[PDB]
Design an enzyme around this catalytic site. Sequence first.
Site, PDB file in Angstrom:
ATOM      1  N   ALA B  20     -33.083  11.821   2.284  1.00 28.28           N
ATOM      2  CA  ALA B  20     -33.005  13.258   1.263  1.00 28.28           C
ATOM      3  C   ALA B  20     -34.049  14.128   1.793  1.00 28.28           C
ATOM      4  O   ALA B  20     -35.245  14.006   1.648  1.00 28.28           O
ATOM      5  CB  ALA B  20     -32.606  13.177   0.145  1.00 28.28           C
ATOM      6  N   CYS B  21     -33.799  15.464   2.247  1.00 34.17           N
ATOM      7  CA  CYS B  21     -34.672  16.382   2.442  1.00 34.17           C
ATOM      8  C   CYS B  21     -34.882  17.296   1.180  1.00 34.17           C
ATOM      9  O   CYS B  21     -34.249  16.636   0.047  1.00 34.17           O
ATOM     10  CB  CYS B  21     -34.299  17.444   3.473  1.00 34.17           C
ATOM     11  SG  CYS B  21     -34.334  16.971   5.181  1.00 34.17           S
ATOM     12  N   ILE B  22     -35.501  18.593   0.967  1.00 32.27           N
ATOM     13  CA  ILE B  22     -35.404  19.184  -0.230  1.00 32.27           C
ATOM     14  C   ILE B  22     -34.290  19.934  -0.652  1.00 32.27           C
ATOM     15  O   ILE B  22     -34.107  20.235  -1.856  1.00 32.27           O
ATOM     16  CB  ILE B  22     -36.610  20.100  -0.277  1.00 32.27           C
ATOM     17  CG1 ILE B  22     -38.005  19.300   0.206  1.00 32.27           C
ATOM     18  CG2 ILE B  22     -36.692  20.986  -1.574  1.00 32.27           C
ATOM     19  CD1 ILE B  22     -39.154  20.454   0.463  1.00 32.27           C
ATOM     20  N   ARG B  24     -31.380  18.711   1.485  1.00 30.90           N
ATOM     21  CA  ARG B  24     -30.255  18.077   2.502  1.00 30.90           C
ATOM     22  C   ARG B  24     -30.203  16.795   1.953  1.00 30.90           C
ATOM     23  O   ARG B  24     -31.064  16.273   1.802  1.00 30.90           O
ATOM     24  CB  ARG B  24     -30.376  18.492   3.888  1.00 30.90           C
ATOM     25  CG  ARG B  24     -30.167  19.794   4.306  1.00 30.90           C
ATOM     26  CD  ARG B  24     -29.837  20.197   5.770  1.00 30.90           C
ATOM     27  NE  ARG B  24     -29.787  21.611   6.131  1.00 30.90           N
ATOM     28  CZ  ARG B  24     -29.098  22.167   7.401  1.00 30.90           C
ATOM     29  NH1 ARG B  24     -29.133  21.162   8.439  1.00 30.90           N
ATOM     30  NH2 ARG B  24     -29.226  23.267   7.666  1.00 30.90           N
TER      31      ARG B  24
END
Lengths: 75, 75, 381, 380
Positions: B20-22, B24
């Site tokens: 997981a991105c910040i 997405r």
Amino acid sequence: MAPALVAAFGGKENITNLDACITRLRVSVADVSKVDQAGLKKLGAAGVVVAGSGVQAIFGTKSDNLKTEMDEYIR
Amino acid sequence: MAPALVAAFGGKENITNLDACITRLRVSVADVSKVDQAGLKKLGAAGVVVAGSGVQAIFGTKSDNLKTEMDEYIR
Amino acid sequence: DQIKQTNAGAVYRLIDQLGPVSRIDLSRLAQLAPASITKIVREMLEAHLVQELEVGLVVETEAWHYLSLRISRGEIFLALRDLSSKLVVEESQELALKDDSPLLDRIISHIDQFFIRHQKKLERLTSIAITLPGIIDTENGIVHRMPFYEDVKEMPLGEALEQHTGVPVYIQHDISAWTMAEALFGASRGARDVIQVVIDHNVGAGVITDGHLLHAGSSSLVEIGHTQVDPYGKRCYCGNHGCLETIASVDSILELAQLRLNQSMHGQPLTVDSLCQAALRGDLLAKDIITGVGAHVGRILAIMVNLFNPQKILIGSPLSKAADILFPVISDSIRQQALPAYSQHISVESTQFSNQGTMAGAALVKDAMYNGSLLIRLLQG
Amino acid sequence: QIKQTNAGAVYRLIDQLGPVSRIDLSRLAQLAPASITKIVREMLEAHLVQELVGLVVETEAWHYLSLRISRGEIFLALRDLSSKLVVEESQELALKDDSPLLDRIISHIDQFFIRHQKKLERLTSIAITLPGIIDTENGIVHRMPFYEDVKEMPLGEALEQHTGVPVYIQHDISAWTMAEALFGASRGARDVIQVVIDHNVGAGVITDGHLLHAGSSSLVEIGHTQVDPYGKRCYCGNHGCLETIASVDSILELAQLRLNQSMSSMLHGQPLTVDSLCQAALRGDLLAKDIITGVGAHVGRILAIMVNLFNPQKILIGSPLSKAADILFPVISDSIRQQALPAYSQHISVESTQFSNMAGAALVKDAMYNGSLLIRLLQG
Ligand SMILES: [Zn+2]
Ligand SMILES: [Zn+2]
């Protein structure tokens, strides 16, 4: 405001015709040499157009009023 | 909420990597055709990006949280 | 959004080029409403596109990537880059030219292949820019006709690829894209007027005046590639005979070196790289081929100067290796043929990016962020 | 600044399509209700535009001085911002005088102004079109073709100081190019190439509706592209230039020198004039013909490369040589089509300009469009 504005064109003896449109002060002199470029601009003019024998002082809406103030500085 | 996400992406037998991105929710998958994009959007995904074999689901701040959910649901 | 889109991409443009600027500085520079500035800025701050240097705002690019790939003759070059265009990884693949499977789909495969192997390096996919030779409908992303790959004809390699990924696809002509890519990143930075000649498998050049890339007729790109410098020469695939691109094209220069090597002088096979190197060392045969090209290009670039008067002239070609022998020739010409008051302050310099650098789409994505048609999509995450 | 480019862009709009409401200005010009409504508010308060829903332009009380310096004559005229004509002069200029030239030009302008001192309603700027190498940035005519005296002439700086309005330097050619597009023959076109062939050679180009400028607004000196590596000296300091081979004078000089030798021509009898050469080139004279053909062939080759760069819609010729069009035109086209990207040359047609003898117009409208002159006009 106008007694020093008549001197900036040279004086009652050099201003042959005093006129003014909506935003300019198209005054026709007898001798452009006598036209004070500094004083005009240091009194409000945003530019002074010397096309031929007629000067055009750029003061703005005060123009239509200034042409009147200068004509009274004779009587 | 977590089990729906696993289902939409094709269930544990399809999720090969899950990160997981910040903003997405990146998750690799064995078969992009087995991924229900329509659902990912209905659950709350702003958009679904498919780059190769890694599906980017745009959830937002609530993304690093759902990666943790989906992570425990696979056990 | 409609004006919020350009209004937004303007604040970004100011923060990408002038950062770190202040909220106030932005309301003064962009000349937009004070409260309107704080809104846009705050959105970017929240969607992680800009960040506060803690008053002090500067773009955030590391976490966002785009795919810049250029297809030029049996080779496809794919790279992942930052929204600043810094690269992450680059790789060059193949395409064969002729194949049992269409090009349209072979291109999509590489893209998938590229992503799979680099799924751990890849971060937030924002878009993909593709640059290639051929007649390109840029606003629809449809390759109409294309050199090298005979069987093309109206290829929606932009729409289908947009669906297969779900990110925007920006497609521009190879030279035009490159010219502005140089103008933002490299060689011709800080010039409103620029001429960039490109000499490879196909000759052509791009120009910038006032600050805009020059177009003709319809899109009718600049075609100095077809300017008959030799009233006879060979037959050109255009119609005439003896077109610049019949003498200056790398393939010709190599057919000339060969068909002039069969009659005495090397050692290793004949390549552009080995040619230039030979001319570099001092060989008179290779040096004569290189000078010869500069004679022609020079003539044309002479009149191209009296028309535009660029601050920079750039040459994009594998031949930039022989800089010492080719450029001087172009310079003399321009100095001997164009107006003295112009040719005075202007030197033929080299292109900063190779004919293979993925950096050609570097502008497509920047134009996307500035025009706003992307910073708005990314605003969601 | 951004204020100048944003202000001049709203004006640029209001005149191309009259009328347009504060909505089309916000929309078509990309501007918010704050920076598209208030930008007109100060233009209405300065009377650069008109009221009546719809917004048009006010261009009658605004004037500008335009003048052209020929090989020996100074033409004057005052015009509205709509490029209308108010008054025109016809004063001779001559070559040598007591005073240099710069001072002579000033007296001329000053004269023109005292007589017609009643026509003028408000001066904004002055726009000059003369031949020679020019700096434009400072308006410093370096050298000229018929006044070897002129060396570094601060015409721009001087004429501004003597009036108080901006000076615009341009060539008779550029100006005429926009004129042809405004009512000439290229009216309605977006991509034109106009070649002039007189005492000066040159070419104006119109790209996508705009008049092509140069790097730093330095003007297109296409006339100084070398065509003959052995030709004669040129005032630009180079030699063999286009202006040196196709210049009408050189044509006659070449005919005259070749007549002075062992050669036949239905031109021996009648003295050599620009008219007599064509008139005799049409009757088949191997000399006059081949001189024009060559002339045609020399301009065509260059014009062929410009076709490849701009792929124009129309190509215009402006020269006394168009009297022998059936020899020229067919040659220029033949040069265009035999050495230019077919697809570009297979739907192009050479035609003569339908006008003769200009006037700024392009530099004054564009002066308004850039917002440069507009800002200075917003307080006046
Ligand atoms: Zn060709
Ligand atoms: Zn010259």
